[PDB]
Amino acid sequence: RFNSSNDERIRVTSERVENMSMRLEEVNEREHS
Amino acid sequence: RFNSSNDERIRVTSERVENMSMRLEEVNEREHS
Numbered sequence: 001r002f003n004s005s006n007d008e009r010i011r012v013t014s015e016r017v018e019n020m021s022m023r024l025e026e027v028n029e030r031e032h033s
Numbered sequence: 034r035f036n037s038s039n040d041e042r043i044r045v046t047s048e049r050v051e052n053m054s055m056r057l058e059e060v061n062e063r064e065h066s
Contacts, residue, residue, distance in 0.1 A: 006040060009047045016054045023057055032066055 002008060035041060 006043055009043050013043075013047045013050050016050050020050070020054050020057055023061055027057075027061055030064075030066075
């Protein structure tokens with residue numbers, strides 16, 4: 001019941017979005033062509 | 034009406050974000066240059 005609450009889902013989504021944004025900026029910065 | 038609720042949108046967004054994070058980590062791990 002705790003893991004299915006809206007607040008926990010929002011927090012986890014925000015953290016994963018931040019990590020994905022950092023990783024995507026890292027990937028885009030590494031360009032050779 | 035069920036598919037447009039906030040809870041369903043949050044759950045679907047969280048699941049898709051998790052899948053995208055896993056896929057992005059898979060892509061970044063596969064680097065050759």
